[PDB]
Amino acid sequence: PFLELDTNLPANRVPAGLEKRLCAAAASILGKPADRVNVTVRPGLAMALSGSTEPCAQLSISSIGVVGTAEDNRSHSAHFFEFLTKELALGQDRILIRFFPLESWQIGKI
Template identity: 35%
Template sequence: MPLCVIDTNIPANNVPDSFQERLRNFLTKLLDKKFVTVRINNGLRMCLGGGTTTEGNIVNVDLYGEFNSSERNKEYSTAVLAFIAEELQLEEKMIAFVIHNIPATHHFTVDMLG
Protein backbone atom coordinates (compact mmCIF):
# COMPACT_ATOMS: atom_id res chain seq x y z
CA MET A 1 0.00 0.00 0.00
CA PRO A 2 1.51 3.35 -0.99
CA LEU A 3 2.24 5.89 1.73
CA CYS A 4 2.33 9.64 1.17
CA VAL A 5 4.02 11.69 3.89
CA ILE A 6 3.80 15.47 3.83
CA ASP A 7 6.03 17.60 6.05
CA THR A 8 5.24 21.31 6.04
CA ASN A 9 5.70 24.50 7.99
CA ILE A 10 2.09 25.45 7.20
CA PRO A 11 0.14 25.66 10.47
CA ALA A 12 -2.64 23.09 10.94
CA ASN A 13 -5.33 25.80 10.88
CA ASN A 14 -4.18 26.80 7.35
CA VAL A 15 -4.51 23.29 5.92
CA PRO A 16 -8.10 22.55 4.84
CA ASP A 17 -9.76 19.95 7.09
CA SER A 18 -10.54 17.60 4.21
CA PHE A 19 -7.15 17.94 2.49
CA GLN A 20 -5.90 14.50 3.50
CA GLU A 21 -9.07 12.79 2.23
CA ARG A 22 -8.96 14.66 -1.07
CA LEU A 23 -5.26 13.83 -1.47
CA ARG A 24 -5.91 10.17 -0.63
CA ASN A 25 -8.73 9.99 -3.18
CA PHE A 26 -6.58 11.72 -5.79
CA LEU A 27 -3.67 9.32 -5.18
CA THR A 28 -5.80 6.17 -5.26
CA LYS A 29 -7.05 7.17 -8.72
CA LEU A 30 -3.66 8.36 -9.98
CA LEU A 31 -1.81 5.27 -8.78
CA ASP A 32 -4.70 2.90 -9.53
CA LYS A 33 -4.58 1.49 -6.00
CA LYS A 34 -7.36 0.42 -3.69
CA PHE A 35 -5.71 1.98 -0.63
CA VAL A 36 -3.25 4.82 -0.02
CA THR A 37 -2.19 6.09 3.39
CA VAL A 38 -1.67 9.84 3.81
CA ARG A 39 0.15 11.36 6.77
CA ILE A 40 0.47 15.13 7.23
CA ASN A 41 2.95 16.67 9.65
CA ASN A 42 2.24 20.39 9.76
CA GLY A 43 3.49 23.36 11.73
CA LEU A 44 7.13 22.18 11.46
CA ARG A 45 10.16 24.44 11.64
CA MET A 46 11.68 24.28 8.16
CA CYS A 47 13.78 26.22 5.68
CA LEU A 48 14.40 25.71 1.97
CA GLY A 49 17.49 26.32 -0.11
CA GLY A 50 20.73 27.96 0.97
CA GLY A 51 19.31 30.91 2.86
CA THR A 52 18.52 31.26 6.52
CA THR A 53 14.98 32.54 6.08
CA THR A 54 11.89 30.49 6.76
CA GLU A 55 9.61 32.89 4.91
CA GLY A 56 6.91 31.27 2.84
CA ASN A 57 5.25 27.93 3.04
CA ILE A 58 7.33 24.83 2.36
CA VAL A 59 6.04 21.34 1.62
CA ASN A 60 8.10 18.15 1.40
CA VAL A 61 6.26 15.23 -0.14
CA ASP A 62 7.60 11.68 0.20
CA LEU A 63 5.75 9.00 -1.73
CA TYR A 64 6.63 5.44 -0.74
CA GLY A 65 5.59 2.36 -2.70
CA GLU A 66 6.51 0.22 -5.66
CA PHE A 67 7.62 2.85 -8.18
CA ASN A 68 10.05 1.46 -10.72
CA SER A 69 9.16 3.28 -13.95
CA SER A 70 10.86 6.61 -14.59
CA GLU A 71 8.19 7.57 -17.15
CA ARG A 72 5.34 6.89 -14.74
CA ASN A 73 7.24 8.57 -11.90
CA LYS A 74 7.43 11.78 -13.98
CA GLU A 75 3.69 11.55 -14.58
CA TYR A 76 3.03 11.01 -10.86
CA SER A 77 5.35 13.84 -9.83
CA THR A 78 3.77 16.35 -12.21
CA ALA A 79 0.24 15.43 -11.15
CA VAL A 80 0.94 15.40 -7.39
CA LEU A 81 2.83 18.71 -7.46
CA ALA A 82 -0.01 20.40 -9.35
CA PHE A 83 -2.64 18.96 -7.00
CA ILE A 84 -0.86 20.02 -3.81
CA ALA A 85 0.04 23.47 -5.18
CA GLU A 86 -3.61 24.11 -6.04
CA GLU A 87 -5.04 22.66 -2.82
CA LEU A 88 -2.64 24.56 -0.54
CA GLN A 89 -2.37 27.65 -2.77
CA LEU A 90 1.41 27.37 -3.16
CA GLU A 91 3.93 27.89 -5.90
CA GLU A 92 5.25 24.52 -7.11
CA LYS A 93 8.81 25.73 -6.48
CA MET A 94 8.04 25.61 -2.75
CA ILE A 95 7.30 21.87 -2.93
CA ALA A 96 10.03 19.25 -2.77
CA PHE A 97 8.90 15.85 -4.05
CA VAL A 98 10.67 12.51 -3.60
CA ILE A 99 9.51 9.09 -4.77
CA HIS A 100 10.88 6.15 -2.78
CA ASN A 101 10.76 2.79 -4.57
CA ILE A 102 10.07 0.05 -2.05
CA PRO A 103 9.61 -3.41 -3.60
CA ALA A 104 6.51 -5.34 -2.54
CA THR A 105 8.76 -7.79 -0.70
CA HIS A 106 9.83 -4.99 1.67
CA HIS A 107 6.53 -3.68 3.01
CA PHE A 108 3.82 -5.47 4.92
CA THR A 109 0.47 -4.92 6.55
CA VAL A 110 -0.70 -6.73 9.67
CA ASP A 111 -2.99 -9.06 7.71
CA MET A 112 -0.02 -10.14 5.55
CA LEU A 113 2.02 -11.20 8.59
CA GLY A 114 -0.55 -13.45 10.27
Template identity: 45%
Template sequence: MPFLDLQSNLPASSFNEDFLKKFTSVTAASLGKPEDRMNLVLHPGLPMLIGGSSSPCVVLSVAAIGVTDTAEKNKEHSAKICSLLTSELGLPEDRVLILFHALQPHQVGKKGTVMSFL
Protein backbone atom coordinates in the same frame (compact mmCIF):
# COMPACT_ATOMS: atom_id res chain seq x y z
CA MET B 1 -0.40 0.00 -0.16
CA PRO B 2 1.29 3.39 -0.79
CA PHE B 3 2.66 5.44 2.08
CA LEU B 4 2.40 9.22 1.91
CA ASP B 5 4.31 11.37 4.36
CA LEU B 6 3.42 15.05 3.94
CA GLN B 7 5.54 17.54 5.86
CA SER B 8 4.87 21.26 5.84
CA ASN B 9 5.53 24.50 7.62
CA LEU B 10 1.89 25.45 6.99
CA PRO B 11 -0.37 25.31 10.05
CA ALA B 12 -2.63 22.31 10.68
CA SER B 13 -5.64 24.49 9.80
CA SER B 14 -4.43 24.47 6.16
CA PHE B 15 -5.18 20.74 5.95
CA ASN B 16 -8.87 20.14 6.63
CA GLU B 17 -10.49 16.73 6.17
CA ASP B 18 -11.76 17.63 2.69
CA PHE B 19 -8.21 18.44 1.58
CA LEU B 20 -6.86 15.19 3.04
CA LYS B 21 -9.54 13.13 1.26
CA LYS B 22 -8.99 14.93 -2.05
CA PHE B 23 -5.21 14.62 -1.74
CA THR B 24 -5.47 10.90 -1.01
CA SER B 25 -7.95 10.38 -3.86
CA VAL B 26 -5.85 12.23 -6.45
CA THR B 27 -2.67 10.46 -5.35
CA ALA B 28 -4.36 7.05 -5.41
CA ALA B 29 -5.65 7.71 -8.93
CA SER B 30 -2.21 8.81 -10.11
CA LEU B 31 -0.56 5.74 -8.63
CA GLY B 32 -3.31 3.41 -9.87
CA LYS B 33 -4.00 2.16 -6.36
CA PRO B 34 -7.34 1.79 -4.51
CA GLU B 35 -8.09 4.63 -2.10
CA ASP B 36 -8.68 2.18 0.75
CA ARG B 37 -5.04 1.07 0.47
CA MET B 38 -3.60 4.58 0.90
CA ASN B 39 -1.78 5.54 4.10
CA LEU B 40 -1.19 9.21 4.89
CA VAL B 41 0.70 10.86 7.70
CA LEU B 42 0.60 14.65 7.92
CA HIS B 43 3.19 16.71 9.79
CA PRO B 44 2.07 20.37 9.75
CA GLY B 45 3.67 23.38 11.40
CA LEU B 46 7.26 22.20 11.09
CA PRO B 47 10.26 24.53 10.99
CA MET B 48 11.39 24.07 7.36
CA LEU B 49 13.66 25.61 4.76
CA ILE B 50 13.66 24.89 1.04
CA GLY B 51 16.38 26.64 -0.90
CA GLY B 52 17.25 28.68 2.17
CA SER B 53 13.74 30.13 2.47
CA SER B 54 11.16 29.48 5.17
CA SER B 55 8.29 30.59 2.91
CA PRO B 56 5.32 28.20 2.93
CA CYS B 57 6.31 24.82 1.52
CA VAL B 58 5.67 21.08 1.53
CA VAL B 59 7.88 18.01 1.20
CA LEU B 60 6.06 14.83 0.26
CA SER B 61 7.51 11.33 0.42
CA VAL B 62 5.70 8.71 -1.66
CA ALA B 63 6.66 5.08 -1.07
CA ALA B 64 4.90 2.35 -3.01
CA ILE B 65 5.31 -1.07 -4.56
CA GLY B 66 5.65 -1.22 -8.33
CA VAL B 67 4.52 2.29 -9.28
CA THR B 68 7.40 4.59 -8.33
CA ASP B 69 10.24 2.69 -9.95
CA THR B 70 10.87 4.69 -13.14
CA ALA B 71 11.51 8.29 -14.09
CA GLU B 72 8.63 8.21 -16.58
CA LYS B 73 6.10 7.08 -13.96
CA ASN B 74 7.37 9.53 -11.35
CA LYS B 75 7.26 12.44 -13.81
CA GLU B 76 3.54 11.76 -14.33
CA HIS B 77 2.89 11.33 -10.61
CA SER B 78 4.82 14.50 -9.83
CA ALA B 79 2.82 16.60 -12.30
CA LYS B 80 -0.55 15.45 -10.93
CA ILE B 81 0.38 15.67 -7.26
CA CYS B 82 2.20 19.00 -7.60
CA SER B 83 -0.77 20.49 -9.45
CA LEU B 84 -3.09 19.53 -6.60
CA LEU B 85 -0.78 20.83 -3.88
CA THR B 86 -0.16 24.15 -5.60
CA SER B 87 -3.83 24.78 -6.38
CA GLU B 88 -5.23 23.63 -3.03
CA LEU B 89 -2.55 25.16 -0.78
CA GLY B 90 -1.70 28.22 -2.87
CA LEU B 91 1.96 27.28 -3.14
CA PRO B 92 4.23 28.05 -6.09
CA GLU B 93 5.67 24.97 -7.80
CA ASP B 94 9.16 25.64 -6.47
CA ARG B 95 7.86 25.24 -2.89
CA VAL B 96 6.73 21.65 -3.44
CA LEU B 97 9.25 18.80 -3.29
CA ILE B 98 8.30 15.16 -3.83
CA LEU B 99 10.50 12.20 -2.99
CA PHE B 100 9.66 8.85 -4.59
CA HIS B 101 10.69 5.58 -2.97
CA ALA B 102 10.26 2.27 -4.79
CA LEU B 103 9.38 -0.48 -2.34
CA GLN B 104 9.64 -4.22 -2.83
CA PRO B 105 6.91 -6.51 -1.42
CA HIS B 106 9.31 -7.92 1.18
CA GLN B 107 9.85 -4.41 2.58
CA VAL B 108 6.24 -3.87 3.71
CA GLY B 109 4.89 -5.71 6.74
CA LYS B 110 1.20 -6.36 7.26
CA LYS B 111 -0.86 -8.83 9.30
CA GLY B 112 2.24 -10.29 10.93
CA THR B 113 3.95 -11.06 7.62
CA VAL B 114 5.15 -9.16 4.56
CA MET B 115 3.33 -8.33 1.35
CA SER B 116 5.29 -11.03 -0.52
CA PHE B 117 3.15 -13.63 1.26
CA LEU B 118 -0.21 -11.87 1.08
Protein backbone atom coordinates in the same frame (compact mmCIF):
# COMPACT_ATOMS: atom_id res chain seq x y z
CA PRO C 1 1.36 3.42 -1.56
CA PHE C 2 2.71 5.53 1.38
CA LEU C 3 2.48 9.35 1.13
CA GLU C 4 4.15 11.57 3.76
CA LEU C 5 3.61 15.38 3.54
CA ASP C 6 5.62 17.77 5.80
CA THR C 7 4.63 21.50 5.77
CA ASN C 8 5.46 24.69 7.73
CA LEU C 9 1.81 25.71 7.23
CA PRO C 10 0.27 25.75 10.73
CA ALA C 11 -2.28 22.88 11.31
CA ASN C 12 -5.10 25.52 11.41
CA ARG C 13 -3.97 26.93 7.99
CA VAL C 14 -4.05 23.44 6.31
CA PRO C 15 -7.44 22.78 4.60
CA ALA C 16 -9.78 20.53 6.67
CA GLY C 17 -9.59 16.93 5.37
CA LEU C 18 -6.49 17.47 3.14
CA GLU C 19 -5.43 13.88 4.10
CA LYS C 20 -8.73 12.55 2.60
CA ARG C 21 -8.48 14.56 -0.67
CA LEU C 22 -4.76 13.61 -1.04
CA CYS C 23 -5.64 9.90 -0.47
CA ALA C 24 -8.39 9.93 -3.20
CA ALA C 25 -6.13 12.03 -5.58
CA ALA C 26 -3.17 9.63 -5.01
CA ALA C 27 -5.40 6.56 -5.80
CA SER C 28 -6.51 8.24 -9.08
CA ILE C 29 -2.95 9.50 -9.98
CA LEU C 30 -1.06 6.26 -9.07
CA GLY C 31 -3.92 4.04 -10.41
CA LYS C 32 -4.20 2.12 -7.08
CA PRO C 33 -7.35 1.29 -5.08
CA ALA C 34 -8.09 3.82 -2.28
CA ASP C 35 -7.96 1.00 0.33
CA ARG C 36 -4.17 0.56 -0.38
CA VAL C 37 -3.46 4.34 -0.10
CA ASN C 38 -1.84 5.72 3.08
CA VAL C 39 -1.36 9.50 3.71
CA THR C 40 0.42 11.26 6.64
CA VAL C 41 0.35 15.09 6.98
CA ARG C 42 2.68 16.73 9.52
CA PRO C 43 1.87 20.46 9.65
CA GLY C 44 3.31 23.32 11.81
CA LEU C 45 6.97 22.19 11.28
CA ALA C 46 9.90 24.57 10.90
CA MET C 47 11.06 24.25 7.26
CA ALA C 48 13.47 25.71 4.78
CA LEU C 49 13.02 24.59 1.13
CA SER C 50 15.49 25.62 -1.60
CA GLY C 51 17.13 27.75 1.14
CA SER C 52 14.02 29.75 2.18
CA THR C 53 11.39 29.66 4.96
CA GLU C 54 8.39 30.79 2.88
CA PRO C 55 5.43 28.36 3.04
CA CYS C 56 6.45 25.03 1.47
CA ALA C 57 5.75 21.28 1.43
CA GLN C 58 7.82 18.08 1.01
CA LEU C 59 6.01 14.98 -0.31
CA SER C 60 7.50 11.46 -0.04
CA ILE C 61 5.83 8.70 -2.12
CA SER C 62 6.83 5.08 -1.29
CA SER C 63 5.41 2.13 -3.26
CA ILE C 64 6.13 -1.32 -4.75
CA GLY C 65 4.91 0.55 -7.89
CA VAL C 66 7.95 2.96 -8.10
CA VAL C 67 10.11 2.43 -11.26
CA GLY C 68 13.67 3.90 -11.08
CA THR C 69 13.34 6.35 -14.06
CA ALA C 70 12.43 10.08 -14.11
CA GLU C 71 9.94 9.48 -16.99
CA ASP C 72 8.07 6.68 -15.13
CA ASN C 73 7.33 9.19 -12.29
CA ARG C 74 7.09 12.54 -14.23
CA SER C 75 3.29 12.28 -14.94
CA HIS C 76 2.72 11.36 -11.23
CA SER C 77 4.92 14.29 -10.05
CA ALA C 78 3.08 16.75 -12.37
CA HIS C 79 -0.31 15.67 -10.86
CA PHE C 80 0.95 15.94 -7.22
CA PHE C 81 2.34 19.48 -7.88
CA GLU C 82 -1.05 20.44 -9.37
CA PHE C 83 -2.85 19.01 -6.31
CA LEU C 84 -0.63 20.65 -3.67
CA THR C 85 -0.38 24.08 -5.39
CA LYS C 86 -4.19 24.36 -5.36
CA GLU C 87 -4.80 22.93 -1.86
CA LEU C 88 -2.00 24.85 -0.05
CA ALA C 89 -1.75 27.92 -2.41
CA LEU C 90 2.01 27.14 -2.84
CA GLY C 91 3.96 28.11 -5.96
CA GLN C 92 5.55 25.28 -8.01
CA ASP C 93 8.99 26.24 -6.52
CA ARG C 94 7.72 25.66 -2.90
CA ILE C 95 7.08 21.87 -3.34
CA LEU C 96 9.59 18.98 -3.70
CA ILE C 97 8.60 15.31 -4.23
CA ARG C 98 10.80 12.27 -3.46
CA PHE C 99 9.96 8.75 -4.82
CA PHE C 100 11.16 5.63 -2.92
CA PRO C 101 10.82 2.04 -4.19
CA LEU C 102 9.55 -0.62 -1.72
CA GLU C 103 9.48 -4.44 -1.96
CA SER C 104 6.63 -6.61 -0.58
CA TRP C 105 8.82 -8.18 2.18
CA GLN C 106 9.30 -4.68 3.76
CA ILE C 107 5.57 -4.31 4.48
CA GLY C 108 4.10 -5.87 7.65
CA LYS C 109 0.34 -6.39 7.84
CA ILE C 110 -1.78 -8.56 10.26
